[PDB]
Design a binder for this molecule. Structure first.
Ligand SMILES: Nc1ncnc2c1ncn2[C@@H]1O[C@H](COP(=O)(O)OP(=O)(O)OP(=O)(O)O)[C@@H](O)[C@H]1O
Ligand SMILES: O=C(OP(=O)(O)O)[C@H](O)COP(=O)(O)O
Ligand SMILES: [Cl-]
Ligand code: NA
Length: 416
């Protein structure tokens, strides 16, 4: 994917300020970083810039989904600056904004070797181009303000590097809108794209996709194209309830539900049938009376339904058996999205059981690819990072590659 693009190995950085988009959207629990994978993954590009004489490296990322409102109490990148220091062996200056005159002054003429991390890009609606105000009402960014936002970011370096593989599916301002003469892909971008190019060229079959998690509105829209590439699909985690409500008339309580995706569920199942893709949905659940680690818990099946005011936060044991059967048939697996709220032990058994099966599959020759901010944290939590074929920093980004697309963050790089 980058044979035609400028990459960092061929970018002259000596004496240049480098502005670098990274994916530092790391998971957090009790206000601390629970997995530094995405930060560590950018260190090779950052160190390369410094070792080869860069005047500065300005790092920019989002964290979470603050929807264009400053939320430094909940989604500040300040903790990431602290963690990056230990991983880099070098000092990092944190700025409390990402644009404006104070940021521009701090980045205009830095001391040699300076590393600077900006605040969450998504505190400004101009990054995504849309969001919500502080009262929760949806809002769209104004074109002239988007261009001024992109112009401000562009002043923070002389050359641009994009190492944000995990965000490469997003055509956001920091990812496609920086206007500098040289825009290069970083070493993590290259590593991930190269791995997927080889693994997706002629997959081992049956090729199973496992789609879970909580980003239902976004990821239900990826299934249509994925159904032209895979032979089996597990639809689990928060994704399943939209399917079960529509197909089975199941009562789902307060479980995650996507109104727009519900309108295409039957068409997706029809396409799966046309293409010979076996769909495995859960059949039982661990329920909770509220979205809380210490919620009261219960059990439910598709036939029983989930009680009003309760939500399904994990699959149950009969679902785990069906998931295991699909893993045993697979010769290649791509997995994005845990099949329950694995961060909370009451709701982690289903994801742990599936991880055990995927590890066993790897040991008998299955090619196993696990990707995503939270899904890769499953590998860290249960110590399986070296027991699957590849742990990717991309989740949705990897699914969009599976669909067969050129990612916007790659398309926007300079051509050779
Ligand atoms: N039934 C469920 N209800 C609610 N949340 C769920 C459920 N099952 C899983 N989750 C949540 O899904 C979240 C992860 O979903 P998400 O799509 O963000 O995955 P990801 O691997 O981080 O992907 P990406 O890299 O694209 O962000 C986890 O925090 C987990 O708690
Ligand atoms: O976490 C990401 O994607 P992912 O959840 O699929 O791994 C990226 O940081 C992009 O975040 P977004 O899905 O809020 O745009
Ligand atoms: Cl979403
Ligand atoms: Na996530």
């Amino acid at each position: 994917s980058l044979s035609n693009k400028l990459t960092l190995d061929k970018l002259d950085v000596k004496g240049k300020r480098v502005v670098m988009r990274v994916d530092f959207n790391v998971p957090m629990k009790n206000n601390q970083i629970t997995n530094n994978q995405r930060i560590k993954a950018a260190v090779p590009s950052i160190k390369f810039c410094l070792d080869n004489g860069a005047k500065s490296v300005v790092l920019m990322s989002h964290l979470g989904r603050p929807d264009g409102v400053p939320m430094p109490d909940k989604y500040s990148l300040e903790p990431v600056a602290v963690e990056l220091k230990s991983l880099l062996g070098k000092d990092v200056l944190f700025l409390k904004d990402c644009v404006g005159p104070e940021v521009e002054k701090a980045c205009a003429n830095p001391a040699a070797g300076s590393v600077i991390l900006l605040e969450n890009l998504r505190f400004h609606v101009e990054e995504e181009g849309k969001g919500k105000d502080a009262s929760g009402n949806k809002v769209k960014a104004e074109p002239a303000k988007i261009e001024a936002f992109r112009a401000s970011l562009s002043k923070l370096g002389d050359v641009y590097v994009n190492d944000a593989f995990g965000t490469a599916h997003r055509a956001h301002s920091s990812m496609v809108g920086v206007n500098l003469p040289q825009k290069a892909g970083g070493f993590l971008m290259k590593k991930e794209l190269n791995y997927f190019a080889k693994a997706l060229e002629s997959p081992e079959r049956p090729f199973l996709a496992i789609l879970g998690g909580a980003k239902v509105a976004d990821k239900i829209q990826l299934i249509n194209n994925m159904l032209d590439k895979v032979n089996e699909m597990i639809i689990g985690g928060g994704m399943a309830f939209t399917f079960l409500k529509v197909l089975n008339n199941m009562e789902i309580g307060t479980s995650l539900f996507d109104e727009e995706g519900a309108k295409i569920v039957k068409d997706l199942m029809s396409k799966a049938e046309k293409n010979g893709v076996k769909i495995t949905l859960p059949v039982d659940f661990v329920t909770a009376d509220k979205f809380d680690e210490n919620a009261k818990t219960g059990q439910a099946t598709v036939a029983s339904g989930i009680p009003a005011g309760w939500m399904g936060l994990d699959c149950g044991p009969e679902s785990s058996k069906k998931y295991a059967e699909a893993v045993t048939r697979a010769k290649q697996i791509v997995w994005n999205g845990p099949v329950g709220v694995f961060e909370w032990e009451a709701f982690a058994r289903g994801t742990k059981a599936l991880m055990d099966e995927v590890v066993k599959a790897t040991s008998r020759g299955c090619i196993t690819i696990i990707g995503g901010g939270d899904t890769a944290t499953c590998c860290a939590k249960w110590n399986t990072e070296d027991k699957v074929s590849h742990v990717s920093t991309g989740g949705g980004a990897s699914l969009e590659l599976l669909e067969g697309k050129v990612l916007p963050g790659v398309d926007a790089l300079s051509n050779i």
